[PDB]
Amino acid sequence: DGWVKVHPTPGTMLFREILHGQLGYTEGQGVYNVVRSSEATTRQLQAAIFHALLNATTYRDLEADWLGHVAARGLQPQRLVRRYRNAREADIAGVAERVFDTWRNTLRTTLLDFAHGLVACFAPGGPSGPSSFPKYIDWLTCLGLVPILRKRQEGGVTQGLRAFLKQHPLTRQLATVAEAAERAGPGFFELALAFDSTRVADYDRVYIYYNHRRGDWLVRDPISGQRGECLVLWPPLWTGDRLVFDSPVQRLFPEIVACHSLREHAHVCRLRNTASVKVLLGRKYDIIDVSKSMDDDTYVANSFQHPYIPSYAQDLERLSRLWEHELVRCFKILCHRNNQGQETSISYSSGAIAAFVAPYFESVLRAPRVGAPITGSDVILGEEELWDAVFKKTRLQTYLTDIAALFVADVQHA
Amino acid sequence: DGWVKVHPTPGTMLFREILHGQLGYTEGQGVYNVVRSSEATTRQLQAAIFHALLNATTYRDLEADWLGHVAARGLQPQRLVRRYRNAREADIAGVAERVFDTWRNTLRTTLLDFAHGLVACFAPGGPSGPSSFPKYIDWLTCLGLVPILRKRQEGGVTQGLRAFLKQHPLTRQLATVAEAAERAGPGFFELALAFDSTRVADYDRVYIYYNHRRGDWLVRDPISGQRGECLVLWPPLWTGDRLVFDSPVQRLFPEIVACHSLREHAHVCRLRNTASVKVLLGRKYDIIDVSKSMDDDTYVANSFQHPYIPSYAQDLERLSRLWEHELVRCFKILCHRNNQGQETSISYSSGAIAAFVAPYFESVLRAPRVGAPITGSDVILGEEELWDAVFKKTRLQTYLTDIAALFVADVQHA
């Protein structure tokens, strides 16, 4: 009652073959390889993990750790003042500031190592393999639908997390690290659980059914028999005895088909003109035309020759430029420019990362909220630069600076 | 009695098929992918929510929170002066200013977290699904009409608000934030109800009737039988025989049709010239012309040959430029360029955001209020920078600065 098959039809297979370059290729299509890059998602995961780790810090625990470090070094301010026996406030303040700076550097590098360990643990799951981001992107590019199958199970990411966390020696060395780990454990476990729950269906196996009257989707895997959900980003259109998607490939399809047909005709015409001389016959390296079978009681009037050969450079150039412009504007890809002449730099714009990465996490993966998203510049930015940027901009720095200021004031005033 | 159907006619279906690119495609048409972007509406929602949250802050609650924080830290100004025992008012003023600054940073991060939570709650349902902004835009671009259907119901947005607001622990932490939230709750509920009540009809199901004698519109859904309202932004014209709309696609239609027909004729002529030699016959790889099928008391006088092949590159280029100029001048889209490079970025102008987003919220969504609209520059800005700007220019900055100045004066005069 109103159901119809959508995906296993030859049209989408032809779309995917076009995406693989099975018919024709152009320089401008190469931009698509940057669209599938998994840099933005990994950067977002790094930012989320950094925020989650640094949001568990406690001021009192940090103060206790600093006091313990000072006691271990035996560098209490009064002892140093009574050893130096001078009223040089600037010198003793500089000494205390240097000690605090060394402690800050050691804490920063320990936190960086722990955070990088967490990021490395989370890395293999998302960008490739199960629930891979390029699979989502080419799902969007071909159809506009992203079928998903869900089942509540454990996975390897959680196993790696539980193996790594329990044996980590950094917890036994710093109370702050252990407290942050134990407070953020449930969140990380839930995040990995969400990672391992979802699975984007492969292109060659899944089935999609659409009903026009009710306007609902059905997606199932014919092998396992499992039913899932069908996510739609831009909806298709029903024109009666047809279905027309609004994916970029759908828009670019007629031009590609026309250019391919032109190239085939050009090749066929080229192979015809191999011979140099051609001779015609009639009723009273070389190719002969015999018209005896058709000249029966017939008289020849005239004979014309015109060796036409089509040209297809302009069509290929236009198709390449069209592909580049369509992929740049549709996915909102930002290109950096040199001073003059050529330009070579491709990255994701802020609008692109928002409108594509955020729906991925929110709906496709159903992960919990990850906080404020990164900007478009942070994708270009490196790992350590992002780490110490978020370290500076977080509230962990304020407690450390306040402690340093109070300690320096107490040292210099006494 | 004067009613005539409008929308299910083949003309509008052909207009939509033109938008999907059935009748060819050009690089100029790709600018349409920026007109349908949902950045402006999300920016407006963020600004409205930020204003609603910031306007509800209370001076007395903030003063009480400041006193409580001072008591918790034990930072009584007189006690600190009696402890330090020095006449350096600059040092104590700097200490108080630093404490106020750290509290400012913590309050800012908590407010940002709560505001981002609300924005994430409102985001999924606004620009897509019900009241889909791209659907509104392509309704405007095809016809000039935006049919709507309304019903008073709750929805997922209200449920998400109910779950998030009452289960967020931030309310139990700061009295000021909870007080502002409980003041702003009714407005957020009304906004969510406005989101959930309005639905924009799909292009493939709804029906539209017009009657020129009275000048009235009728819109109905043939499936559910529900009757809605028909909104008009630029009115159409009635010429007796037909109804002529004034949407951009209507103006650009004849040029598109002419170019498509020219391309078809060029292809047909191209397929004819695949034969190198052509032969003619008459009464006393190869193509034979037997004109003796008609020869009866006849005599051949002369023969001619002229293999014409039309060219269509200039037409395609002109059509692309016309498409780009029409879209830019109609939707008022601002284009940015480098020193010599073209299309550094594409963004909505202030006139565009006003004249398109504001009528959307005011009529289609029937939102109660959106506050002062943002400029075109705020679209480029990210969420965090926009939040910083609105926080700087809001009412709350008055109370915070006044309290900080008064406390600094009291500390330095203690």
Numbering used by the authors:
A (entry chain a), B (entry chain c): 24 to 27, 29 to 308, 494 to 623
Source paper text:
A unique portal vertex exists at a 12th I5 vertex through which the genome is translocated during assembly. Here, portal proteins assemble into a dodecameric basket-like structure that is thought to seed the assembly of scaffolding proteins, in turn driving the formation of spherical procapsids composed of MCP, SCP, and triplexes. A separate protein complex, the terminase, associates with the dodecameric portal and initiates genome packaging and the concurrent autoproteolytic cleavage of the scaffold.
In addition to features consistent with previous herpesvirus structures, our data set reveals a previously unidentified capsid end product. These new capsids feature C-capsid-like “elevated” portals and, in many cases, terminal genome within the portal translocation channel, but no organized genome in the capsid lumen. We refer to these capsids as “D-capsids” because their C-capsid-like portal suggests they were originally C-capsids, but the absence of most of the genome indicates that they are degraded. In D-capsids, terminal DNA density exists in multiple conformations including one reminiscent of that in C-capsids, suggesting D-capsids are products of failed DNA retention. However, our D-capsid portal structures have the same portal basket position as C-capsids despite being mostly devoid of genome. The C12 reconstruction of both A- and B-capsid portal baskets revealed a small hook-like density with large aromatic side chains and sharp turns wedged into a hydrophobic pocket between the crown domains of each portal monomer.
